[PDB]
Amino acid sequence: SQAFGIQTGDAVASTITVFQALSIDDQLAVLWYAYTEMGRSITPAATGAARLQLAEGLLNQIKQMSHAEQLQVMRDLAAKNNTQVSRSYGILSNNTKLAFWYELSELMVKGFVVPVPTDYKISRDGSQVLEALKGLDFGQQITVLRKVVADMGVDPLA
Template identity: 50%
Template sequence: MTYTTDRITQSTNVLDVVSTVQATINTLSTDEQLGLFWVIYENLGGAITPAAPGAAREQFTQGLLTKVKALSYEEQLQFMRDLVNRINNPLTRSYGVFTNNNKLAFWYQLAEGMTTGEIVPVPDDYKLSNAGLSVFSQITRLEFGQQITLLRKFVVGMGVDPLA
C-alpha cells in the first residue's frame, strides 16, 4: 500500500505548516489517525529511521515496549487508541514521561513490531479514507524536516504526562 505524490517546497513558516496539517490530523477518528500513522511508516519509515531511533535512547522505551508486546492484539490496539485519546492509565503514563525523540522512536518500534507480528498488524486490505488520503498527501508535500517536526508533534501530544 504505497502512496505517492509530488513533493513541493514550502516557503512558509515551518510551524504554521505543521500546525495546519496537525489540526487536520486531529479531525480524523482515532482509528483513522492510527491508520494514517501506519501508512506514514510504510511510505516514509526508511527516512524516519535515522531521525527517530538515532536521536533517541531506545533503552528507555524497552520496558514499555516489552509490556505492550505481552498484551493480546486487542489490548495492544486499545493501548494505541488510549495513547491517541490521552486516556489516563499506567501504560499511557509510562509513555507520557518519554522525551519527544523517545516518543517518536517508540512509535517507530511499534510499527516495526507490527511488521513482525509482535504488535497487532494492520489488516492487509486496509485503505485510508478520502480524508486520510488528503492528510497523507499534505504530509508528503512537506519537506523532510517538516515531516519529522509534524510526526514528533503528533506523538508528543499522545499519552498522559504524569508530571503535568
C-alpha cells in the same frame, strides 16, 4: 511577503491540526502509512532512542499483550485516556516517543505486534491528511510527527 500583516500559510502547523482532528482509527492508520513512506530514509539503527530504559520496558509490556490489548493501548494513547500505559508513555521525552512508535511498527513488520488491516479504509479526511504529510519535505514531516505523538498519552503535569 509580510508587508500587510498577512501569512501565506503554515504547512506544518496546519497538518498537525488536521491530523489531531481525525478519528482515533484514522490517526493510527495515517501514522502507519507515514512509517511505510519514510521507513527507508529513517534506518532501524538511526533511531538510537527506543533502547532507553523507559521506552524499552513499555515496548516489551505491549509486545506481550494480545493483539486486541495492543490495539486498545494504542487507541488509548491517541485518545489520551488515563491508563498506566498512557501515563508511562507521557513521561517519555518527545524523541523517545517518536522512537517508541517507530519500534512498534518494526515489531508489527516482524509479526510481534498486531498489524494494520490492509482492508481498513482511511476516511476522506484521513486521506487528505496523509496526502498533505506526503507533500511536506522530510524535515517538516519529522516536525509534524513529533508534535502529533508528543500530545499522545497522559500529560505528567495534568
